[PDB]
Amino acid sequence: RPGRCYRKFSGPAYTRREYIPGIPMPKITKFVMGNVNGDYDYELRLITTEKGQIRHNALEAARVIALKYLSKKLASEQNFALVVTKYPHHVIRENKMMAFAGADRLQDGMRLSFGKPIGTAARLEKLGELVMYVRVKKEHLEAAKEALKIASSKLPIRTKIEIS
Amino acid sequence: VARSKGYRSKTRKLLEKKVREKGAIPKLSLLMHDYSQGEYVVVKINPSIHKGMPHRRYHGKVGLVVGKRGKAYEVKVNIGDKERVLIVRPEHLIPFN
């Protein structure tokens, strides 16, 4: 389903697992890559500039592409540390009954319209929240800006890159 | 769905007790005063004393003492434009001002 459906806030935070049966497993499983505790010079970060939600599909695709680019440059355990910070706590739900139960003269239309869970997302409730960062030495500062630019292309919210 | 209208409905947090007020009645010095007719009191429900306990709608209101029946007091309170008389045990009262 198009991402414009689940990019905006519609309702409260829906996270309590004990009152929500049958939540699908998120696509993201590994949130920290590389060699943390390595000796690094630069600590550049990816910062959002709007409020919204990021589906767990967008969050996993932005991670595979960034890891492949950095691993393509020199190596994997070598001097880079890739970390994605936000976890998908919010649960997004769809009134799927328009598919099946909306055509049996079953509770069709908007009758009994509370939806069923379809996946998870990361609410971004503040302006300027950290989403990813990567740590490299001084010789790799350029291959690290490009990794974050390619990853920023697969995310719904407008972002920046900051160097420190 | 419409809400159940029990006696203690929608009181999950009004009838809380803070961590430093728990236990069987702590303050005895308030109970050593005998309210006379014409005094002003505040209806403050004590969640741990379950006898002579008023309704949620009167918590924090200011009443006037008009009499006594046994160990409990007759308190006249205003809700809107209506006068209402309650019989409250003194563990659910504090003096006003």
Binding site: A99, F100, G102, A103, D104, R105, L106, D108 | -
Partner: protein, 232 residues
């Protein structure tokens, strides 16, 4: 080589692979596409929705399951074609939709086939019906190589080497990119083929089954190869 086999119905699918002359089933699953009678809506307009919607939901998982079992084989470049069969229009709806990956969809060999049965007996029926296609699909590099060899011979550019004595000279230098060996058990040709594989030279073994094999045997004695670079 590996050939993909798919049989799809309105509510049943079978996935298999053809490894040489062996047929192996990968997954058989049902879909629960109901009819008009266990319904339901008791309305003509919206009863036809379900029958045409979990029909599509079933086709979605057929495509998804095909992707999981066939994409690994493609990444090692081991599949050479995909044959799809089945009764009705189920095969047409699956092939012409977006439910197959473009890598898989590009390997589907036309045309689609009518198969009445499912399971392993159905898979063997699909192979029997497509024996004509697999005849053309089994020798392509050999047919391409002979045309390329014929082009180089006329140009007289020395890119093609022939003769048992001269081939052994080029084999030691690793200059023969591909060596076509006529099938002759117990002769020097078979022994030469076994040695040739040690130098990285791809070897194609052909016999009388190909009309071009007679041309190779009559002219070059059955031994002819293509050179990676000019030698003399």
């Amino acid at each position: 080589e590996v050939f993909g086999l798919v049989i799809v119905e309105r509510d049943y699918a079978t996935i298999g692979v053809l490894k040489g002359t062996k047929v192996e089933v990968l997954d058989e699953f049902e879909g629960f596409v109901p009819g008009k009678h266990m319904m339901g809506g008791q309305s003509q307009r919206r009863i036809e929705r379900i029958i045409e919607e979990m029909y599509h939901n079933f086709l979605k998982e057929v495509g998804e399951k095909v992707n999981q079992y066939f994409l690994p084989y493609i990444e090692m470049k081991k599949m050479k074609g995909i044959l799809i069969g089945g009764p009705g229009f189920a095969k047409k709806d699956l092939y012409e939709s977006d439910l197959l990956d473009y890598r898989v969809k590009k390997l589907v060999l036309q045309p689609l086939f009518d198969i009445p049965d499912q399971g392993e007996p159905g898979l063997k029926e699909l192979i029997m019906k497509a024996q004509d296609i697999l005849k053309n699909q089994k020798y392509i590099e050999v047919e391409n190589l002979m045309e390329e060899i014929k082009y180089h011979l006329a140009k007289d550019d020395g890119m093609v080497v022939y003769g048992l004595e001269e081939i052994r000279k080029a084999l030691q230098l690793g200059a023969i990119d591909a060596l076509i060996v006529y099938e002759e058990p117990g002769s020097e040709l078979e022994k030469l083929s076994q040695e040739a594989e040690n130098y990285g030279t791809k070897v194609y073994v052909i016999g009388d089954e190909l009309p071009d094999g007679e041309w190779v045997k009559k002219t070059f004695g059955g031994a002819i190869g293509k050179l990676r670079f000019k030698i003399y």
